[PDB]
Amino acid sequence: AFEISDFKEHAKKKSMWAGALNKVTISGLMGVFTEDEDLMALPIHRDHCPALLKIFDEIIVNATDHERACHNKTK
Amino acid sequence: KVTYIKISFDKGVFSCENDGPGIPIAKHEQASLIAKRDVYVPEVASCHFLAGTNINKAKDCIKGGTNGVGLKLAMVHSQWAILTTADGAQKYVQHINQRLDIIEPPTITPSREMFTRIELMPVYQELGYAEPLSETEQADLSAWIYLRACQCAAYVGKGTTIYYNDKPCRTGSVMALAKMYTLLSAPNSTIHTATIKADAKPYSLHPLQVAAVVSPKFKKFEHVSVINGVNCVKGEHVTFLKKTINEMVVKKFQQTIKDKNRKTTLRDSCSNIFIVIVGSIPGIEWTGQRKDELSIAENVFKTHYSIPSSFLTSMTKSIVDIL
Amino acid sequence: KTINEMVVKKFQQTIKDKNRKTTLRDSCSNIFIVIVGSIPGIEWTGQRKDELSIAENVFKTHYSIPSSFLTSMTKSIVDILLQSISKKDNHKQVDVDKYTRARNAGGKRAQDCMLLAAEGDSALSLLRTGLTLGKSNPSGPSFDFCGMISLGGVIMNACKKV
DNA sequence: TATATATATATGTGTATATATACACACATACATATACA
DNA sequence: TATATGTATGTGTGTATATATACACATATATATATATA
Numbered sequence: 001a002f003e004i005s006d007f008k009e010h011a012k013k014k015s016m017w018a019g020a021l022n023k024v025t026i027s028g029l030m031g032v033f034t035e036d037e038d039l040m041a042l043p044i045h046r047d048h049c050p051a052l053l054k055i056f057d058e059i060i061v062n063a064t065d066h067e068r069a070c071h072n073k074t075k
Numbered sequence: 076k077v078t079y080i081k082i083s084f085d086k087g088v089f090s091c092e093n094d095g096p097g098i099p100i101a102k103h104e105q106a107s108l109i110a111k112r113d114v115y116v117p118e119v120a121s122c123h124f125l126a127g128t129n130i131n132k133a134k135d136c137i138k139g140g141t142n143g144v145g146l147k148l149a150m151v152h153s154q155w156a157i158l159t160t161a162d163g164a165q166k167y168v169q170h171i172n173q174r175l176d177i178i179e180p181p182t183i184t185p186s187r188e189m190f191t192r193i194e195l196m197p198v199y200q201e202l203g204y205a206e207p208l209s210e211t212e213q214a215d216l217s218a219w220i221y222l223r224a225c226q227c228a229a230y231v232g233k234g235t236t237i238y239y240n241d242k243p244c245r246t247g248s249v250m251a252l253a254k255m256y257t258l259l260s261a262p263n264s265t266i267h268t269a270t271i272k273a274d275a276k277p278y279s280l281h282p283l284q285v286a287a288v289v290s291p292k293f294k295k296f297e298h299v300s301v302i303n304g305v306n307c308v309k310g311e312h313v314t315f316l317k318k319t320i321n322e323m324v325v326k327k328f329q330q331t332i333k334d335k336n337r338k339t340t341l342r343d344s345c346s347n348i349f350i351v352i353v354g355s356i357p358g359i360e361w362t363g364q365r366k367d368e369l370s371i372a373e374n375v376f377k378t379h380y381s382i383p384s385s386f387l388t389s390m391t392k393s394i395v396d397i398l
Numbered sequence: 399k400t401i402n403e404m405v406v407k408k409f410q411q412t413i414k415d416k417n418r419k420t421t422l423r424d425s426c427s428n429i430f431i432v433i434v435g436s437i438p439g440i441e442w443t444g445q446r447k448d449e450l451s452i453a454e455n456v457f458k459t460h461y462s463i464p465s466s467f468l469t470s471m472t473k474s475i476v477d478i479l480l481q482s483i484s485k486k487d488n489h490k491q492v493d494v495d496k497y498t499r500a501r502n503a504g505g506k507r508a509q510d511c512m513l514l515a516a517e518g519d520s521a522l523s524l525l526r527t528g529l530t531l532g533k534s535n536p537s538g539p540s541f542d543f544c545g546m547i548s549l550g551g552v553i554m555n556a557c558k559k560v
Numbered sequence: 561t562a563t564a565t566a567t568a569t570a571t572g573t574g575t576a577t578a579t580a581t582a583c584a585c586a587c588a589t590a591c592a593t594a595t596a597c598a
Numbered sequence: 599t600a601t602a603t604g605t606a607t608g609t610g611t612g613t614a615t616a617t618a619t620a621c622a623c624a625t626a627t628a629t630a631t632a633t634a635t636a
Contacts, residue, residue, distance in 0.1 A: 002116050004105055005125040005143065013130065016142050017445055020360035020370040025311050047372050050362070054446060068436070294421050333492050342427060363444025384592085518576055551576030552621035 018058075019050025026050060080227060081238040084220050087199065087207055092192040097160040100167045100183065115181060117167055121146050121158050121193075122178055135277040137355035139304045144364055149195060151175045152202070156195035161188040174198065223306065225255065229284075229353050230301045249286035249351045256299060257349055261290040265393070269386035273379040281355035283312070285386070288349045289393035296345040301353045302369055307361075310369035312352060315376040317345050323391045324398075331395055339398070347397050348390075400463050401425060404472045409479055420479065428478050429471075496522065496548040500541055511543045522546050 011017045029044040077095040084090075099116045106114040106123060119126050127143035129136070150156055156171045166186035170179040200206040208216065221239050228237035228244035229252050237244040246252050250266050257264060271283040298313050300306070321344040328339060360370040402425040409420060441451040496519060500511045514529075516522050529540050 002099070002103060002119055002128055003126065003130040003143075004103075004109070004119060004123055005130045007125070010125045010130070010142075013132075014142050015360040015362070015370065016144070016364045019362050019446055022360070023372065024360065024370040025373040027311075027314075050370065050446070295423055334490050337486070337489055342423065346423065362446055362448055365443055367443060367449075549576085550620065552574095554621070 015051070017051070018054035021049065021051050023047035023049050026053075076232075077235055079236045079238060080224075080231065081241070082220065082224050083238075083240050084217055085240065087213075088194065088196055089220075090192065090194040092190055094190045097162040097167075097189055097191050100160065100162050100165045115167065115169075115183075117158050117160055117169060118178065118181065121150055121156075121169070121171060122175060123147070135280075135357045137281060137303050137357055139366065141361075142364055146193075147175065148364075149193065152197055153195040154198050156193065159190075159192040159194070161186045161190055163187055163189045225252065226299075226301045226306055226353075227304070229351075230304050249284045249353050252299060252351045252353070253286035253288055253349065256351070257288045257290070260292055260349075261288055264288050264290060267386055267389045267393070269383045271380050271382050273381075275379055277357040278375070278379045281357060283352055283354040283356075283380070285316070285353075285382075286351045287386075287390060289347050289390060289397070290349070291347060291397050293347045293349055296342070296348055298350045298352065300351075303355055303359065305366045305369075307369055308367055310359075311371050311373045312356065312369070312376065313350070314373065315380070316350060316352070316382065317341060319382050320344060320348070320387065320390050320394070323387050324394050327391050328395050328398055343398065344394060347394060401429070401468065401471050401475070404468050405475050405479075408472050409476050412476055412480065413483070415483075418483075424479065425475060428475060494547075496546075498522075498526075498541070498546040500543055500545040502543055503545065507543075511545065512539070513545045513547060515547050515549055517549050518551070519548060522548060 005013075012021075015021055025047050026044075029046075029048060030041050031044050032039050033042050034040075077093050079092075079094050081092045082090070098120055101116050103114050103116050103119045106119045106126075123143075124147050125143045127140060127146075129138060129140045130143055132138075132141050150171050151174050153171070153174065155173075158167075158169045158171065160167050164185065164187070166184050166188060167181055168183075169181035171177070172179070199208060199212075204212050217240075221244075224237050224239040224244045225246040228246050229249055231237060233247075246255055250268060253266050265288070267287045267289070269285045271285060273279045273281075296317070300308070300310065300313065302310065302312065318341070321341045324344040325339060328337075329335060356369070356371070358371075358375075362368040362370060399422070402422045405425040406420060409418075410416060437450070437452070439452075439456075443449040443451060502508065502511050514525055516525060525546055528538075529544055529546075531538055531540075
């Protein structure tokens, strides 16, 4: 059967947008952990959802985009 | 069944034709309701983004297709294209031109043939190439397509011939692929072979075929993977083989060495290896439309798959010799 | 690639072996790099933006890595390369050939043991014949306080290679 | 361009040793491949 | 989860086949290595 999808349902079903929509092994996955006033970058040896990290990432890069866009400006 | 996949590349024109059941020559209701005119299924399949038979993929499905996008990507990068498809009672010819801007109405006749053919001219100039293609660009692109066809010929089933520019593609086995890739670095070499099986469905339905060469004149680790028909370049299947071989290599290296103190890692273990891995894996996901990298939990292989010990032993032997 | 080209040059310089050929994996496997900044005109391989797409020559034409950084890096890397040349390849080995230790070597009665260093292996066959007179020679020596080793023919002199 | 190293080769008559292959067969050690199961 | 069951290696003997290597000793020559000159 040939189906036509909209953006919404597509993005919920398809991994092409943000990565896998379930937990997979992400090679090089790191996080920052505090050990007595010291930041350490440590590996996270546990599967996680790439799309879940992407929704954080998309907003964060929108913010840093705005920062560059305004850095030579008045406001 | 699909008994053949004919691929051709000549004077810039690119063509691909298969002979299973054709694409349904039938009116698509919802697509016509959207378009306010008569739209048939091949027009949806070729001109409607996010559309196809894989929008709702099963967890056991081993087709590469998933997004309903690839075919329209081909059309959008075509100066002109021709979709021809026949279902045994009708033939259907539709021309799709100017990067999907001109979609001519289709022409439907009676025919008793059954096949699907896409034929197109890319926009080589818009994409950075000469018009027409230079001698070097033409030769490079022909070689690359020829390679992809050889890869298909190893992945495809045994009743299916892969043709490129009308010659059949030789390489129906991962051993043939390994020999092709190592003909220069290491001619006349030893090919370690394994069929990696799983015990639980769906994985047990899809054994992975593996061929590896081990040479001192290999400078880094290297793999070729066809997974679900996709020539992808990154995925935890590779790491599964790498880690397994490394654990055995470390064990036997400390055994064979009477130094008994030196510590080697995966780079030492694997930098003299060239591996070809071909087959299907159910339930995988990708990191984008290109499908460069498959996404999976590593434990899928730790739980379900086993690498035959004869292959591991052979490999470890060759590698520890080199060490 | 830039670091590797410099590392290969100075490795062949510093090494008086002058024959060994190292590649990028040898050059770079001991490196951790952070690169931060903006590059105009790049493209990606998908929405995720895992991989940026660019012509390599953009950097060959336009960018230069400061030589002080390259020099520092090459220095650290070649130090490790020579340590792995002194080590790894030339690591610890084992015991020598034609050597029969005594039962009391390096122990609580270590000082009262002998090393009967012989000239070849037929002499060691004679010494093995003679140190095993079991009860036919109660006053003779045996392997409880005697060892055997071969001198390899003629000894090298050290009085003119020093 | 200079004064200065330290390692490097070849000759005869001597001193010491190393190692690959064939051929037959009783015997020893290593899985591994199933087949009941469990 | 133990069991066999058919696979694969592996030294060993006498009489054959074909090779390999360390060291001493004197002196003339050599090819690249080195200061410090600058």
